[PDB]
C-alpha cells in the first residue's frame, strides 16, 4: 500500500447544493453531492461559495449528479476560476435532494 | 507528493460527440465529454474515430454523461477493441450538448 497526501473541503455551492471534495495525491479529486437544489436557472452561476484555490482544476470539469428517488439527472461545471455553473434543468421553489460521486484531475 | 506518467488523447468519436481522455500512471483514465450528439440510434456503433490502443480498456467500460440544460442522461460503452457504442436514447437531427466526467481502469 502506497501513502499519499489527502486534503478535504466542504463547499456550500449555493441554492442548497452541498459539495464534499476529497483530493488525494494533490491531483485526483472525488466530489460528493449533498443537500437539495432549488431556484436555479440553467447555465447560471450558483449563488454560494466558490471552490478554494487548492481544489481548482486547470481546465473545466463537468460532474454528473442525480436527483434522489427520481430518474432525472443534473450536472455542474467547476471552472478553473473557482466558480460553479449549474447545468441541470430549471429548478423551481421546491427543493430536490441531490446526490452523486464525480471525479476529476487538477494537473 | 508522488509524480506519475501522464498521457493524453482526444477522440472525435463521431456524431458530434468529442472525447477528452487523460490516462495517469498507465491505468486511471478520466474521460471528459464534449461536443453535441445527433443522429444516433440506441446500441449503434458511433460513426467516428475509434479509441487508440494505449487507451483501450481490457474489459468494457460504461461511462455516464449528461445533456446540458436538461434532466436527461446517456451512457457510452468503450469496448476493448476500441469501438464506442451509443447507449442513450435515440437522438434525431437536433444536436444536444453532451458533458460529463467518467473514469475507468485499463488493467
Amino acid at each position: 500500500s502506497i501513502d499519499v497526501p489527502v486534503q478535504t473541503l466542504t463547499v456550500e455551492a449555493g441554492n442548497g447544493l452541498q459539495l464534499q471534495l476529497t483530493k488525494k495525491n494533490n491531483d485526483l479529486v472525488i466530489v460528493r453531492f449533498f443537500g437539495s437544489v432549488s431556484n436555479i436557472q440553467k447555465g447560471w452561476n450558483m449563488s454560494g461559495t466558490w471552490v478554494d484555490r487548492p481544489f481548482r482544476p486547470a481546465a473545466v470539469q463537468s460532474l454528473v449528479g442525480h436527483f434522489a428517488g427520481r430518474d432525472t439527472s443534473f450536472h455542474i461545471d467547476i471552472n478553473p476560476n473557482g466558480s460553479i455553473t449549474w447545468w441541470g434543468a430549471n429548478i423551481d421553489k421546491t427543493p430536490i435532494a441531490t446526490r452523486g460521486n464525480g471525479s476529476y484531475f487538477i494537473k | 507528493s508522488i509524480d506519475v506518467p501522464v498521457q493524453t488523447l482526444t477522440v472525435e468519436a463521431g456524431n458530434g460527440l468529442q472525447l477528452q481522455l487523460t490516462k495517469k500512471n498507465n491505468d486511471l483514465v478520466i474521460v471528459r465529454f464534449f461536443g453535441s450528439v445527433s443522429n444516433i440510434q440506441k446500441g449503434w456503433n458511433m460513426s467516428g474515430t475509434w479509441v487508440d490502443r494505449p487507451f483501450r480498456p481490457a474489459a468494457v467500460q460504461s461511462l455516464v454523461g449528461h445533456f446540458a440544460g436538461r434532466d436527461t442522461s446517456f451512457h457510452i460503452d468503450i469496448n476493448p477493441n476500441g469501438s464506442i457504442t451509443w447507449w442513450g436514447a435515440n437522438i434525431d437531427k437536433t444536436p444536444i450538448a453532451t458533458r460529463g466526467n467518467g473514469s475507468y481502469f485499463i488493467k
Epitope: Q41, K42, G43, W44, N45, A59, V60, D77, N79, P80, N81, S83, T85, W86, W87 | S36, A68, G69, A97
Partner: nanobody, 122 residues
Framework: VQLQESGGGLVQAGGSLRLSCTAS????????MGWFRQLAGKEPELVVA????????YYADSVKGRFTVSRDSGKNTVYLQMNSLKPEDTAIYYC????????????????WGQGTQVTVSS
C-alpha cells in the same frame, strides 16, 4: 482594452437596431457575453447573454422573442439584433463578459464596456 462596443444610437418606434461587442481575451471556461439594461433611475438588469462553450442563450421576460443574440466563430464577438422596439426600452446598454456562466450580479464580469446610448422615438 477588455471590450469594444459599436452600434446603437437613435431609432424609430417598432424599428430595429444592432449592437456589437468583441473581446480581446478569454479569461476561462463557460465564457459568456451579453448586455445589461439600466433604465433611467432604475436598477440595472441582465437582459441578454450567450455561453460560447455551450451555444445557449438567456433572454429577459420583457425582451423574449423580440431580441436575438448570436456569434460568428473565432471572432470572440456577440451580436445583438433588436426588433419591435418599444418606447420603454430606451436605456444605456452595457456590454459585459465573464467566465463562469450567467449572473444577475454586476459582480465580476472581467470585461465591462463603457456603454452605448439607445433611444427609441415614437
Amino acid at each position: 482594452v477588455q471590450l469594444q462596443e459599436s452600434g446603437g444610437g437613435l431609432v424609430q418606434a417598432g424599428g430595429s437596431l444592432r449592437l456589437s461587442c468583441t473581446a480581446s481575451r478569454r479569461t476561462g471556461s463557460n465564457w459568456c457575453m451579453g448586455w445589461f439594461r439600466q433604465l433611467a433611475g432604475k436598477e440595472p438588469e441582465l437582459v441578454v447573454a450567450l455561453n460560447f462553450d455551450y451555444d445557449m442563450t438567456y433572454y429577459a421576460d420583457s425582451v423574449k422573442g423580440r431580441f436575438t443574440v448570436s456569434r460568428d466563430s473565432g471572432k470572440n464577438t456577440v451580436y445583438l439584433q433588436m426588433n419591435s422596439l418599444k418606447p420603454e426600452d430606451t436605456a444605456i446598454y452595457y456590454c459585459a463578459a465573464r467566465s463562469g456562466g450567467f449572473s444577475s450580479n454586476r459582480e465580476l464580469y472581467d470585461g465591462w464596456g463603457q456603454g452605448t446610448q439607445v433611444t427609441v422615438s415614437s
